[PDB]
Amino acid sequence: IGKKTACVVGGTGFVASLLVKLLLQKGYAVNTTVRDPDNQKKVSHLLELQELGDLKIFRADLTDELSFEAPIAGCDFVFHVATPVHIKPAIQGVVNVMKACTRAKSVKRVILTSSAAAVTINQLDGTGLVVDEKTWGYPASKTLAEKAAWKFAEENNIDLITVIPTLMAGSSLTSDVPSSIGLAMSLITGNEFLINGMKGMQMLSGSVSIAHVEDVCRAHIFVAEKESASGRYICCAANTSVPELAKFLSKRYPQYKVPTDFGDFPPKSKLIISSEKLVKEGFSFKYGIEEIYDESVEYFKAKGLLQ
Numbered sequence: 001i002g003k004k005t006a007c008v009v010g011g012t013g014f015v016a017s018l019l020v021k022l023l024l025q026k027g028y029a030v031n032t033t034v035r036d037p038d039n040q041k042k043v044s045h046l047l048e049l050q051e052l053g054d055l056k057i058f059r060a061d062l063t064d065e066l067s068f069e070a071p072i073a074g075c076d077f078v079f080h081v082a083t084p085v086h087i088k089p090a091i092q093g094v095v096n097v098m099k100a101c102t103r104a105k106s107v108k109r110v111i112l113t114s115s116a117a118a119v120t121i122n123q124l125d126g127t128g129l130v131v132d133e134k135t136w137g138y139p140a141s142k143t144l145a146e147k148a149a150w151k152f153a154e155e156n157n158i159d160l161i162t163v164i165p166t167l168m169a170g171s172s173l174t175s176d177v178p179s180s181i182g183l184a185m186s187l188i189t190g191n192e193f194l195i196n197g198m199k200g201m202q203m204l205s206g207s208v209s210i211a212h213v214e215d216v217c218r219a220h221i222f223v224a225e226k227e228s229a230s231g232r233y234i235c236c237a238a239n240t241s242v243p244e245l246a247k248f249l250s251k252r253y254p255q256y257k258v259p260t261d262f263g264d265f266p267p268k269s270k271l272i273i274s275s276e277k278l279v280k281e282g283f284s285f286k287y288g289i290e291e292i293y294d295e296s297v298e299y300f301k302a303k304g305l306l307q
């Protein structure tokens with residue numbers, strides 16, 4: 001029967017977890033993976049999801065192409081998030097996984113997540129970053145991992161499609177908060193460091209582009225299900241600037257004090273990131289900027305990271 005199966009590597013992932021939960025709700029039979037099941041806190045959100053449907057964990061490292069044989073087998077779709085909200089490891093992580101998809105008839109299609117943003121963004125979680133008085137890459141650019149994924153796929157006739165996101169906010173199943181929201185939320189949080197971060201985001205990528213992880217997630221499935229889908233799919237809901245965002249947050253969040261004056265800082269960003277191709281192929285974004293921020297704000301408080 002049309003009893004549908006899919007595999008979602010690295011189930012701990014901010015994006016991934018959310019896929020799984022969401023797949024399960026769609027009826028799919030989900031297999032996911034993780035390095036070491038033996039962090040009780042780590043999987044804590046994964047256990048809860050079992051309640052929703054037939055979720056079979058598997059234990060996987062991106063180092064043994066063997067790991068993937070187990071979880072990958074029987075699944076119509078493989079979802080691997082190449083660049084997780086947190087270089088050589090991913091690039092290897094993407095071949096192995098793809099390797100295993102050669103060794104299965106079941107796998108009708110692979111859909112991969114890579115973005116330049118996350119790459120950078122997780123640098124911001126890095127240690128020893130230099131501060132001056134007064135990295136960031138072309139948003140539509142292809143990570144090596146992505147680039148590597150494409151080559152292979154082409155060489156081994158696999159059916160790949162990639163989803164290219166930007167700033168991802170909303171809420172997350174995972175216990176700890178993701179850098180990426182904190183950054184999306186720094187304007188409300190008032191974290192000076194993260195604001196400069198986001199300020200750079202604008203100059204060095206020349207856009208403040210954002211999306212809700214559920215929407216980024218749906219986008220992944222939809223493309224997975226749409227038989228007519230070919231290629232890369234830039235997924236961003238909102239386009240803005242650090243000033244014009246902070247104005248906008250000020251005039252929707254009286255409860256909080258969002259810095260409303262930048263002086264020199266450019267009011268417009270150089271680039272607008274369009275998900276037309278995506279929309280053109282028929283996706284509709286549930287969450288706009290307003291709902292992204294209510295969502296992100298309401299989670300943060302629920303996280304106990306607000307007043």
Ligand SMILES: [Cl-]
Pocket residue numbers: 013014015016081083084085
């Ligand atoms: Cl993620």
